[PDB]
Amino acid sequence: ERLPYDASKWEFPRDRLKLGKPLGRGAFGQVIEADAFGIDKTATCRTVAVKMLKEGATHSEHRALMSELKILIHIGHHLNVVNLLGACTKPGGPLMVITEFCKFGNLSTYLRSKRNEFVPYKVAPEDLYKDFLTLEHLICYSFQVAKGMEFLASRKCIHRDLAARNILLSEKNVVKICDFLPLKWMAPETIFDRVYTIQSDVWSFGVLLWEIFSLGASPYPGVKIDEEFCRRLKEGTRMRAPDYTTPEMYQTMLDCWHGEPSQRPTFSELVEHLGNLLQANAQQDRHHHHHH
Ligand SMILES: COc1cc2nccc(Oc3ccc4c(C(=O)Nc5ccc(Cl)cc5)cccc4c3)c2cc1OC
């Protein structure tokens, strides 16, 4: 809010956008796919995702969208956080926040679809697994999302709703943190106290990890989200390891779900750790590939 808006640098002409098919419609607005012309110095007509208010919006929902915009401008650029490309804010038309487009969509659905196209790792002839998901992909995504969460935290930013559904997938397996029951991702303190901290996000990153290594499964399978659910969560109970997880990964999930927020790792530690797990898997994969 107090944050400024440099229209010289961000404002984009409305008539330079051809709004396409709706991608998703929420309770405050909607995201729409679109073509933008001259959005960036390079290409001529780039596909983008535009977030605008839905017909008949409370003067406040407006300001909310504007704040999201300034926040994005404040946050800055990072490969692992959906990139802000422009914005239509001056009078004349509806308020619109423009970002890059990620053709593969949300990570959860994406993973869910690769369940018949997965192999721990690849060996020759590797064309048997063309476009296949592997542990390296699964670990890579976790690495990326952590680097983006490290970035966000380093800017006093608290996501509040970190989950696979808020992760978009682009070309070359590059994931991006974005933001469109949620109790299944909420930390105990967030549920019983309404307290959102950076560490409450680490808890959620824990739930995200489980999603990633269950290839898009829904957390707490079977469990009904009720008093008992919350009671058990508070008391220590935790999800079992997902079908595609590794020993080290699952443990990180437990670490993330620690009861004391202060005892949970930090995103910086998580980046440091996953990078390592990513490295080991690689070396391992290299020997697997080399002998077979
Ligand atoms: C599957 O096809 C799709 C591809 C997509 N590719 C990119 C963006 C999409 O929708 C989005 C997702 C997030 C945002 C944010 C935004 O993420 N703001 C934000 C960022 C960080 C923080 Cl902390 C707070 C708010 C700001 C403005 C517009 C947005 C549009 C897509 C939607 C799709 O439909 C489902």
Side-chain angles (χ1 to χ4, degrees), residues 8-21:
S8 310
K9 171 183 183 188
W10 295 108
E11 198 72 17
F12 188 60
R14 295 198 173 84
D15 74 7
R16 287 301 190 83
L17 287 179
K18 267 199 174 178
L19 301 173
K21 55 172 184 184

Side-chain angles (χ1 to χ4, degrees), residues 230-274:
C230 295
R231 196 218 90 210
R232 303 199 185 89
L233 201 67
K234 187 176 184 171
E235 264 171 54
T237 299
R238 307 279 176 262
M239 283 192 259
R240 300 173 187 170
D243 296 357
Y244 306 80
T245 188
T246 63
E248 296 75 44
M249 204 56 80
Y250 180 57
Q251 184 56 55
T252 287
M253 289 174 223
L254 306 164
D255 294 325
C256 289
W257 301 326
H258 197 300
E260 282 302 309
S262 63
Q263 298 310 295
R264 298 169 193 158
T266 65
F267 284 116
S268 311
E269 296 176 316
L270 289 164
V271 184
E272 167 60 23
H273 188 51
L274 298 175

Side-chain angles (χ1 to χ4, degrees), residues 40-56:
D40 50 28
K41 302 177 176 180
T42 62
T44 322
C45 172
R46 172 176 190 168
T47 295
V48 299
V50 178
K51 176 180 297 196
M52 47 186 262
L53 297 175
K54 192 180 178 179
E55 309 66 56

Side-chain angles (χ1 to χ4, degrees), residues 21-173:
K21 55 172 184 184
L23 283 172
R25 296 177 183 177
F28 298 87
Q30 63 182 336
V31 179
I32 306 173
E33 178 182 295
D35 279 323
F37 298 74
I39 186 74
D40 50 28
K41 302 177 176 180
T42 62
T44 322
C45 172
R46 172 176 190 168
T47 295
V48 299
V50 178
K51 176 180 297 196
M52 47 186 262
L53 297 175
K54 192 180 178 179
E55 309 66 56
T58 315
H59 166 296
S60 58
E61 311 185 315
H62 175 81
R63 124 186 183 185
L65 188 52
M66 261 301 304
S67 309
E68 191 177 310
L69 164 62
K70 303 175 180 163
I71 283 180
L72 273 171
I73 305 178
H74 177 273
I75 285 179
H77 171 273
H78 189 290
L79 182 55
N80 298 118
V81 173
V82 66
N83 301 178
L84 170 76
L85 299 189
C88 306
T89 69
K90 300 200 178 176
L95 170 52
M96 304 176 282
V97 175
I98 318 172
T99 75
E100 57 184 313
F101 184 69
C102 300
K103 69 179 180 180
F104 302 95
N106 95 79
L107 194 51
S108 182
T109 299
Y110 177 79
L111 292 173
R112 192 112 49 57
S113 72
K114 308 293 295 189
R115 293 197 183 169
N116 283 181
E117 298 182 351
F118 175 99
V119 280
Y121 61 84
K122 301 183 176 174
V123 293
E126 24 196 359
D127 60 25
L128 180 61
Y129 333 110
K130 191 171 68 179
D131 314 316
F132 250 47
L133 278 194
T134 69
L135 280 187
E136 175 166 287
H137 297 66
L138 299 191
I139 304 179
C140 200
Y141 303 146
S142 298
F143 184 46
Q144 298 182 58
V145 180
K147 283 187 302 179
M149 275 313 285
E150 174 176 40
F151 175 70
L152 286 178
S154 73
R155 286 186 158 58
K156 293 169 78 163
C157 261
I158 293 175
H159 193 297
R160 304 184 68 194
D161 188 41
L162 181 59
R165 63 185 141 82
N166 279 313
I167 310 300
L168 301 172
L169 174 64
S170 285
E171 294 294 51
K172 298 176 172 179
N173 302 104

